Amino acid sequence: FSMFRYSNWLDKLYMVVGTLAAIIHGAGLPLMMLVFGEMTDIFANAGNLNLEEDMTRYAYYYSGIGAGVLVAAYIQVSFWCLAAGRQIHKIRKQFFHAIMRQEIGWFDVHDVGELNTRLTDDVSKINEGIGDKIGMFFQSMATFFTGFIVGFTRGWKLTLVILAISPVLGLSAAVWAKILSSFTDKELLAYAKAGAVAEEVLAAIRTVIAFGGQKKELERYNKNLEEAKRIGIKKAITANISIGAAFLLIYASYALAFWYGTTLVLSGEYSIGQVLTVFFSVLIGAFSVGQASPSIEAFANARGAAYEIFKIIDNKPSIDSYSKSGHKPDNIKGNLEFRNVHFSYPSRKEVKILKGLNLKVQSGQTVALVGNSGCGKSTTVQLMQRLYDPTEGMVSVDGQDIRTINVRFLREIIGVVSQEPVLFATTIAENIRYGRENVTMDEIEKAVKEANAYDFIMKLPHKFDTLVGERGAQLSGGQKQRIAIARALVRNPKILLLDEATSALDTESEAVVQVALDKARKGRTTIVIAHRLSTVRNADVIAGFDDGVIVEKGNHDELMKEKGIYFKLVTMQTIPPVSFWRIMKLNLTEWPYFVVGVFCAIINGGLQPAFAIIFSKIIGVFTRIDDPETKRQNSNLFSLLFLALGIISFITFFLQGFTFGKAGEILTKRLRYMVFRSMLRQDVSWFDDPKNTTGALTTRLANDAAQVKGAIGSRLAVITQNIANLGTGIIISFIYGWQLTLLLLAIVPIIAIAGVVEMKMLSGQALKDKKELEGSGKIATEAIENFRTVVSLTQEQKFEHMYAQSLQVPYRNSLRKAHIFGITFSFTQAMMYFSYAGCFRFGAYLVAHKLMSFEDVLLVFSAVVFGAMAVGQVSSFAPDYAKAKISAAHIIMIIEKTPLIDSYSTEGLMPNTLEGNVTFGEVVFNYPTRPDIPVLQGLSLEVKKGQTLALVGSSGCGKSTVVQLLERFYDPLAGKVLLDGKEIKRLNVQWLRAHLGIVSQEPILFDCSIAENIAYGDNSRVVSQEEIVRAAKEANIHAFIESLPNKYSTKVGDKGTQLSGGQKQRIAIARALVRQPHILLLDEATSALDTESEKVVQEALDKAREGRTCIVIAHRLSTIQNADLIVVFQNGRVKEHGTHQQLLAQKGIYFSMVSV
Ligand SMILES: CC[C@]1(O)C[C@@H]2CN(CCc3c([nH]c4ccccc34)[C@@](C(=O)OC)(c3cc4c(cc3OC)N(C)[C@H]3[C@@](O)(C(=O)OC)[C@H](OC(C)=O)[C@]5(CC)C=CCN6CC[C@]43[C@@H]65)C2)C1
Ligand SMILES: CC[C@]1(O)C[C@@H]2CN(CCc3c([nH]c4ccccc34)[C@@](C(=O)OC)(c3cc4c(cc3OC)N(C)[C@H]3[C@@](O)(C(=O)OC)[C@H](OC(C)=O)[C@]5(CC)C=CCN6CC[C@]43[C@@H]65)C2)C1
Ligand SMILES: Nc1ncnc2c1ncn2[C@@H]1O[C@H](COP(=O)(O)OP(=O)(O)OP(=O)(O)O)[C@@H](O)[C@H]1O
Ligand SMILES: Nc1ncnc2c1ncn2[C@@H]1O[C@H](COP(=O)(O)OP(=O)(O)OP(=O)(O)O)[C@@H](O)[C@H]1O
Ligand SMILES: [Mg+2]
Ligand SMILES: [Mg+2]
């Protein structure tokens, strides 16, 4: 995959013209430097002695080359970006077409989300990897070679030494980049412990809040943050040392080159202009190669990904849903013959589900299926639709094999109502019309009437226009089934397969659905897989599938007389803003560091005007007319000075780095600490919201250093360095004349913006496109995750056309952005050449009257222009400021958060002793996530000291909500709750959490030692190993722990992978019992555990029941039998209360549950 461009045979003209334009543009700059050297030489010759004519001629040369540069740059960038846009459009369209056309098995194998992220990331990477980067690389190569050519043709010795020095700097920069990358990877690795701890704690937020173990997790995260801080400080020091060494090497090379050139010219060789042009061209060539480092790498970054994408296009599917070569029968009579159907799913090919079966079905035969859970009746259903292919068998209709007919046409005549129908997020009318494009409003009404969906469909607003919510959120359990049935019927299917037709909420609509389905069956063959036998009785025939083969056959009476498995089954069943002054939170911790950093930044910035002054003096050495030998010595004084400056730079930068990094890491630590603390000292409701997801929160806490540290330190560093450099240059220039200084000030801004934009053109080329790509994202994703239904009804054509339109809508935007980027880049490039021309023409005109010496004019020009270029480059170098500012605003918002239930708060009551007598009255509460769904209906409970209460009812009554409110996770909307006649709100939060104990319905265990895991139940006190052993004996886990290796030292794995689920539940129960809470709550303690284990847990609870109020929420009525009191929930309202014997005497809802 070295040449992965294949589209728009006429687009290659764009690529070729762009390549030529890039070559000529890169070659131009060395020509500009050559004419600059010639102009300097002629100016020096004039100074030694009509200069106006020569100055005008060279100004015209500058103007012509600048116009050529503008045209070439526009052609290059515009054409290359045009080609990139066209290629990316074609690639995305083809890739989506291939994905939709792919076979079902291939999708079932690979993760669908993986495929979606592959699509988006790979296409974005390819977009970044061609067009702009290719043009930049060709420009860099052309500049390299042309500069070397200019140096050689106008130099024989100085060019050689410059070229030989160049690889030293190149290798130094390469090794610096390599070490920086490796150490950045190491630093990333250094956050593994912190990331894991944060993820585990956030996932266990509920349990940790219940146990009040914030301090230990915070300390662990603090240790991890300290390690990461050391790593980051080392990283920053290394990077700053590398940059300083690069600058030192550059200045050493410049000093050596200028010294050698001065010696050579003093020997009588080529004059100063030749030295200047040769040196500048050599440096341009030697440093242009570095500009190519991203492009090629980006190409590689865009290379491998492309490979993978192409593979997906390459694979021709076994079942081409888009192919039309398949035969198309004219009249399709209802008749099915599946003989020796043997097959298995390639996802797990080891297990063979289909082992050959015989099934002959006539027209309009409601052949029901009977078997066991997982017997493979849904495999027979799937194989019926021709999605897969039998390993060895024959499925035919009307004597013709399934493969003998076109897949699309064959699937069109066959409708399937899956167990979990999915409706696309379109209009209900569009949902119905998905069956066939040629569907009229009258047909839609007829289908609605047949499905008996007229009431539900028309009652809501927009009867034929309502947009179905994501995954039918607005729809109902039976509404989706009715809509699917109507859509299936809209296609006039010949074979209708059904699976779990109305197994969603009840059978009220099931009767209507069955009546509608059975209304028309003469021509439309039917197959049904219904768990309920109600419709089985009316079934024309019933086939019993077992061991991958049909066993039972015949009518219901025949099956009953045959003593089949079906007979036994029937018998049994019957945008906050930001602020800088406010964001100055590092001053307290960096009062003496920021000052040194600013001082070093000022010195580094002033280094540039020092270079300008030194270079101007060096040129003036020969610009002078005295021409003594002393100049040689003077030249040395200048030449050596160069080296000195470099050394100073190498110091300051290093001294800067250790400062800046030290300023950063500290904050990076503190924030990472503080934010995490602020995360724990918050209410659960804050964690209960779409915004706060564990992944989002942990990423925000993880990728925050680079933003806050950037915006704080780097902003000040770059601002100080830039003000130093540019202001010093401006003042020094104004000292040496002002008119030329005024013109150069006028032309500085274009230079600065050009530098900034060109620097940004490498990395941040593609950052705003996604905001439009999402317009198709959903459309693609909706067709990937929910692809089974789409392939079922053959609706890929509409999805691909919609994808085409959604790509077209931003395609014009992409074209326009390409054009504007090209135009602005070309104008930016031409700006420098125009500035050179105008400024030097003005300087020549001024010096003609002896107003200012040529040396002064050159000094001002160099100072101001080089300062503009330096500010552009350095401003581009620093991290982006907007993203950093918004991230810092988010961090400030998080850290400043004030909760409704603050654990850290010391305001509250801390009673010495309590009887644990709970009294809740008129308890009203709603979940802040969905306040429009109240769960509490004014409960009334009064549990006395040493009293056991149990909660029963139907799922969804909020049983777990009672426990949640007991721990004071959520404040009550209304009602009074008192533990021994004391207001809950007035009571302390930490004391309440410690004194009480709970057992999670879904217990989780951290990746800690068994002893440590058990001890984590309690906090703020050292638990002796003897206490842990006694508690384990309480839960009957001491012997189990001893049996396993390491005893309690056995490091429990993540979620206790090694340990059994029942073992994890027992460990959680033991941890809860360690604190010996007065009030203990177990929500489905049994749940999934050994019956003997549940009995042992109940016995252990009873042993400590005395003086320990207990609450139990479990489905095992046997445990509730001995419960002191039982309360049955009725939609959040308690119906009956009292002892179990009283409940038995007072028959009611519980009576049915006990019998059930
Ligand atoms: C004329 C073109 C060029 O000279 C090319 C680079 C950038 N500038 C000139 C000055 C310069 C360079 N580096 C600077 C750092 C701070 C301030 C200025 C510079 C330049 C260099 O060292 O002079 C020879 C350079 C730059 C980079 C550079 C190497 C380099 O020296 C050749 N790296 C290749 C990239 C880089 O992003 C990368 O991915 O390395 C693979 C790299 O990151 C790493 C991993 O170190 C790095 C640090 C050197 C990171 C942040 C900024 N990016 C920009 C590109 C990259 C650099 C050379 C213009
Ligand atoms: C249209 C915007 C712009 O292209 C921006 C820069 C300036 N001009 C274009 C011409 C240009 C650039 N460089 C030239 C060298 C010789 C002749 C012409 C140029 C430009 C570039 O490299 O594009 C390929 C550039 C120039 C520099 C430049 C960056 C730059 O863009 C890559 N640097 C800011 C300085 C520089 O001296 C410096 O950073 O250290 C002091 C820098 O040295 C380094 C470290 O690369 C360098 C270029 C190698 C060296 C010697 C002379 N100084 C003066 C300014 C500085 C340059 C690009 C206009
Ligand atoms: N598309 C599929 N990909 C992979 N495995 C599948 C697929 N469909 C079914 N299976 C698995 O193959 C076996 C066959 O069971 P299948 O799902 O076909 O039964 P069923 O008739 O739907 O019964 P039930 O719904 O009562 O479990 C099961 O283990 C099932 O999980
Ligand atoms: N964090 C939450 N976000 C959204 N809804 C929630 C949240 N916590 C609870 N709910 C809602 O509260 C109810 C959950 O009931 P709860 O589990 O408290 O009682 P239950 O009778 O023990 O439950 P189940 O019958 O499901 O075992 C559901 O309505 C659920 O939507
Ligand atoms: Mg099934
Ligand atoms: Mg529950």
Swiss-Prot record:
ATP 1 binds at residues 371-378. The chain crosses the membrane at residues 9-31, 61-81, 131-152, 160-180, 237-260, 275-296, 595-615, 640-660, 716-736, 738-757, 818-840, 857-878. Residues 15-301, 594-883 form the ABC transmembrane type-1 domain. Changing residue 776 to A: Risk factor for IBD13; has decreased enzyme activity. One of its GO terms (biological process) is transepithelial transport. The lineage of its organism: Eukaryota, Metazoa, Chordata, Craniata, Vertebrata. Expressed in small intestine. Expressed in liver, kidney and brain. One of its GO terms (cellular component) is extracellular exosome. Residues 336-572, 918-1156 form the ABC transporter domain. Keywords: ATP-binding, Cell membrane, Cytoplasm, Disease variant, Glycoprotein, Lipid transport, Membrane, Nucleotide-binding, Phosphoprotein, Repeat, Translocase, Transmembrane, Transmembrane helix, Transport. GO terms for molecular function: ABC-type xenobiotic transporter activity; ATP binding; ATP hydrolysis activity; ATPase-coupled transmembrane transporter activity; carboxylic acid transmembrane transporter activity; ceramide floppase activity; efflux transmembrane transporter activity; floppase activity. Its main location: membrane. Translocates drugs and phospholipids across the membrane. Catalyzes the flop of phospholipids from the cytoplasmic to the exoplasmic leaflet of the apical membrane. Participates mainly to the flop of phosphatidylcholine, phosphatidylethanolamine, beta-D-glucosylceramides and sphingomyelins. Energy-dependent efflux pump responsible for decreased drug accumulation in multidrug-resistant cells. It is found in: Cell membrane; Apical cell membrane; Cytoplasm. Residues 153-159, 261-274, 616-639, 737, 841-856 are extracellular. Residues 82-130, 181-236, 297-594, 661-715, 758-817, 879-1156 are cytoplasmic. It is a multi-pass membrane protein. PANTHER family: ATP-BINDING CASSETTE SUBFAMILY B MEMBER 1, ATP-DEPENDENT PERMEASE MDL1, MITOCHONDRIAL. Its EC number is 7.6.2.2, 7.6.2.1. The keyword Isomerase does not apply. Belongs to the ABC transporter superfamily. ABCB family. Multidrug resistance exporter (TC 3.A.1.201) subfamily. InterPro entries: AAA+_ATPase, ABC1_TM_dom, ABC1_TM_sf, ABC_transporter-like_ATP-bd, ABC_transporter-like_CS, P-loop_NTPase, Type_1_exporter. Interacts with PSMB5. Finds in a complex with ABCB1, TFPI2 and PPP2R3C; leading to the dephosphorylation of ABCB1. ATP 2 binds at residues 953-960. This is ATP-dependent translocase ABCB1.
